[PDB]
Structure 1
Amino acid sequence: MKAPVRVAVTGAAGQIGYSLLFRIAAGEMLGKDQPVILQLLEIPQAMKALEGVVMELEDCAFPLLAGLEATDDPKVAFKDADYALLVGAAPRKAGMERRDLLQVNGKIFTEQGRALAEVAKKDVKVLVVGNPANTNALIAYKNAPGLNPRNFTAMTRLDHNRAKAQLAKKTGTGVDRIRRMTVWGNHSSTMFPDLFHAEVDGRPALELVDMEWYEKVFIPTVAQRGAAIIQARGASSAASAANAAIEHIRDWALGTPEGDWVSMAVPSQGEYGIPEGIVYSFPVTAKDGAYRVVEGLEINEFARKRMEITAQELLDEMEQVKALGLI
């Protein structure tokens, strides 16, 4: 058995946490032979509920759960953390506007970024799920001087998975036969699901589906999927989002399949002309903790335009945050 790794998870008493923690403790994120120590964080008002989650975790009698600790102190939750999943974010209460939301998120991620830089492992892998994910990750790494900025990522894997699901459904093929899907940019509605390099059973996706469907059906449907789940279930897609978070960390820590790639929002270094610094989703391959953007892909006008649009939205968000003195 490998030495235990410490996995910090914030917003632990929430919906995503409830669908995330058990699978992590079961070994679904880092391997069935990798013991994990869960270090859970919540706000003071949710600590009672978190104790309940702690009890449920204990009641699963997980052989890989080497340790379990709940706290409301980021410096305790992130202490010696190998992984940190930042799920908690500013909730939209009545009266609050975007700018107000950014203020609160600014405080949350500046504090957590500083806490991570102060007490976590130097190579701690960070995934931001709390929205707005890309910008929150930016706030976090900018306030985490002393930590590799590339270790601060944002989640787009749910959109990535939803895109694969839609393509599989349309072509009548198993989702396991869909490869090289790419979601570029922001986690938002400007998110761009790329089918130009995707393959279905080895065949180019655009040889099986046409541009009309791609533009008028595929894109809108992937973008509205979250809302579709809420309209049907009456609750947010916590389980599939948790699954995506697990895969995001898993494929990064372990590795992506040969000849395939995944989507991850990471600090740009200028790849594909994307402004440097902003956290942007790119097609990436990964191996044992290290990822690399798949550069060199041919980009047509349809993709370029959409990649530019989402890049601009991220730039504007960055400027808004900069104007607030958060970075």
Structure 2
Amino acid sequence: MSAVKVAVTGAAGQIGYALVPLIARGALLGPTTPVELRLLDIEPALKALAGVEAELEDCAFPLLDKVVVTADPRVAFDGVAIAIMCGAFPRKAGMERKDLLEMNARIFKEQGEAIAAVAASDCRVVVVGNPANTNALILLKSAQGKLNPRHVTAMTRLDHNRALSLLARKAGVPVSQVRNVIIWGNHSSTQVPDTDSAVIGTTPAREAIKDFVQVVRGRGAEIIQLRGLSSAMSAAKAAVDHVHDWIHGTPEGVYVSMGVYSDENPYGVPSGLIFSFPCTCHAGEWTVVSGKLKQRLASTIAELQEERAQAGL
């Protein structure tokens, strides 16, 4: 019954602000499970992190055993079982995707080295910050074989939850009845949102519906148009869902989208990528669900291969 150590990077940012109270209240590891939060951000953010820590204290969360704030990944990751990687170099005006990938490669190499050096052997990692799939690949490869490749993932669950919700609104049904949308491929505009296997209760969703891909791909930009700011609440909620389903299991009959290491996948997607697939999770482990498709994936595969080359990988 020792507290489970959970690291959150980018912890002075808006996703981190929305995420840490969910972890502390028990949404991640369960309502009985004590947690320790290890919060990482850049050195100029130390005072802001102290502010986050002070607010966490002021919540009087019964499960939150300890909070540590740091700018050193070797401190943040020390003994951690779960690492939620929100920190990343943000896209500035004038950057192409390649520029963003190159700014992020240094971050994720340092973090992957640190995780391999000091985290628990079985540490499970999810990358939220963009470009998420490639950042996760960089992280994994920087561990030089010391990190289980099945334990490094990238988050497509915000896109998945966006698609569940959209399908529910289009069908006029409660979102609680909708399952088994699939986001394939990259967490980018080449993602393939797929409703062909989706159901409402057990009814194929098509049979219940009397722009979908564009709306899902464009939703982040829509949030920015409305709010002036990127999604934070919903991203934090998705990161909790990604991890919670991974650790606790997906319920019977449900699969969820996860960016996972592609070696040995049942779809013939190239090896050596972090690629979003439909997954069940049982006993802390993902399994890709087969039979749900292939030419549909060519563009997102090609983009992931291009990014991997750009990563010097």
- The amino acid across from 2:246 in the alignment is W
1:283 corresponds to: 278
Q: 1:221 to 1:95 in 2, by over 3 A?
A: closer
- For the pair 1:104 / 2:103, whether they are aligned, the reply is yes
Q: TM-score, normalised by structure 2?
A: 0.96
Query: What is the CA-CA distance between 1:317 and the residue it aligns to?
Result: 0.8
Give yes or no for contact 1:190–1:306 (8 Å, CA) kept in 2. Answer: no
- For the pair 1:225 / 2:219, whether they are aligned, the reply is yes
Q: 1:34 to 1:317 in 2, by over 3 A?
A: same
Q: Tell me the distance in 2 between the aligned counterparts of 1:230 and 1:201.
A: 33
Mapping for residues 291-302 of structure 1, pairs under 5 Å:
291-295=286-290, 297-299=291-293
Q: 1:97 to 1:316 in 2, by over 3 A?
A: closer
Give yes or no for contact 2:127–2:136 (8 Å, CA) kept in 1. Answer: yes
Q: Tell me the distance in 1 between the aligned counterparts of 2:292 and 2:117.
A: 41
Task: Please list every run of 5 or more consecutive structure 1 residues that lacks an aligned counterpart in the other structure.
Answer: 211-216
Q: 1:98 to 1:199 in 2, by over 3 A?
A: closer
Query: What is the CA-CA distance between 1:96 and the residue it aligns to?
Result: 5.0
- For the pair 1:170 / 2:170, whether they are aligned, the reply is yes
Q: Tell me the distance in 2 between the aligned counterparts of 1:44 and 1:231.
A: 31
Give yes or no for contact 1:255–1:286 (8 Å, CA) kept in 2. Answer: yes
Mapping for residues 99-248 of structure 1, pairs under 5 Å:
99-144=98-143, 145-209=145-209, 217-248=211-242
Q: Let me know the Cα RMSD of the aligned residues.
A: 1.3
- Comparing 148-157 and 307-316, the one that deviates more: 307-316
Query: What is the CA-CA distance between 1:237 and the residue it aligns to?
Result: 1.0
Q: 1:240 to 1:274 in 2, by over 3 A?
A: same
1:67-123 deviation per Cα after TM superposition (whole angstroms, max 9, x unaligned) = 100011000000000000111001234565544433321110000000000000011
SS for the counterpart of 1:252 is helix
- For the pair 1:274 / 2:269, whether they are aligned, the reply is yes
Q: TM-score, normalised by structure 1?
A: 0.92
Q: Tell me the distance in 2 between the aligned counterparts of 1:157 and 1:249.
A: 10
Q: 1:103 to 1:199 in 2, by over 3 A?
A: same
1:43-63 deviation per Cα after TM superposition (whole angstroms, max 9, x unaligned) = 011111111001000000000
Sequence identity (%): 54
- The amino acid across from 2:225 in the alignment is Q
Task: Please list every run of 5 or more consecutive structure 2 residues that lacks an aligned counterpart in the other structure.
Answer: none
Q: Tell me the distance in 1 between the aligned counterparts of 2:3 and 2:138.
A: 29
- The amino acid across from 2:196 in the alignment is F
Aligned residues: 311
Give yes or no for contact 1:153–1:279 (8 Å, CA) kept in 2. Answer: yes
Give yes or no for contact 2:37–2:68 (8 Å, CA) kept in 1. Answer: yes
- For the pair 1:312 / 2:305, whether they are aligned, the reply is no
1:284-317 deviation per Cα after TM superposition (whole angstroms, max 9, x unaligned) = 011231111112x142xxxx33322111111111
